[model samples]
Target: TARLLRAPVAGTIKLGKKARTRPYRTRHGEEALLAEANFDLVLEGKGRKETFAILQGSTIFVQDGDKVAAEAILAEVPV
Candidate 1:
């Protein structure tokens, strides 16, 4: 059995200001896209953007608008 983790410190998730639709929904009768963002990176001198999305269906505990901690579970890693 796996044990749940808790947050250590306090911080906010840098979710972008864009509300998208969630393709999947939560099993608890709740669902939302929340937020998303793109970070530009230079790979091989070509510009690339990294995407980040948060959803109530996929993410546990905290969503896009949820504040994050510093040492413990940082927004629930999928592993």
Candidate 2:
């Protein structure tokens, strides 16, 4: 099994102010614009902050301003 994406440190998660959505063609012959998953995860802890790149098609478990601990599951990356 592939490893899940985890938080590097305890901090608040912040998705960008404007969630960017993209259009894609579906297998059912339908096309639509969908909200993009968090492309980046920003963890601000103590006196510093760090950013982690989330896989393009990853499913995120946390939300904007969500508090997370180190090693906490943040998202499931595409295998």
Candidate 3:
């Protein structure tokens, strides 16, 4: 079974500079959701930070400067 993406730490969310929304084509030549949605989910902790490579058609749950929990679901990648 596919797993849901989770936050590793409790911190503020900061998206990567290059993060943007763009649709991607699939093997069937259709603009599929997979790989079309991408972002860099960065978690800023106490003098430390963790960057999550949020790819694979994920729907982000938090925005910049938003507080997050360690066990929270940052995004969801559909099956």
Candidate 4:
């Protein structure tokens, strides 16, 4: 079954620390969607976060600045 990603808190889908300056490949990868609180996926209104990963692979429906609720599919796990 697919898993729905929910917003633990309402905030922007903030990515990396230096993402705005560096190239995407330089940060995590070209397709960088892995949980690396050590490197990326920082949340706003909250400081640097420790991430909980999606063990099943997912396709993120929302973009970098999009809003999500405590509901269905911010990202979806594959079947």
TM-score of each: 0.29, 0.64, 0.65, 0.44
Q: Worst lDDT window (10 residues) for model 2?
A: 26-35
Please give, for residues 1-79, the per-residue lDDT of candidate 3 as tens digits. Answer: 3346787878888876777644545344754333344667788987689887776566565666889888887665665
User: Alpha carbon lDDT of residue 29, candidate 4?
Assistant: 38
Between prediction 2 and prediction 3, the one with superior lDDT is: 3
**Pick by TM-score: which candidate is best?**
3
lDDT of 2 by residue, 1-79 (tens): 3347788778998767545546655334555333375466677877679776765555566777888888987765666
From the highest TM-score down, the ranking of the candidates is 3, 2, 4, 1
For every candidate in turn, the CA RMSD to the true structure comes to 9.6, 6.6, 6.6, 8.0
Top lDDT prediction, candidate number: 3
lDDT of 1 by residue, 1-79 (tens): 2233344445544344453333334345545332223221111111322233333323334444455544434222233
Off by over 4 Å in 2: 21-38
How far is 27's C-alpha from truth in model 2 (Å)? Answer: 18
lDDT by residue (1-79, candidate 4, tens digit) is 6665566665666544533222123122344343322323433435433243433234444456765544424444445
Which pairs clash (backbone N, Cα, C closer than 3 Å) in model 3? none
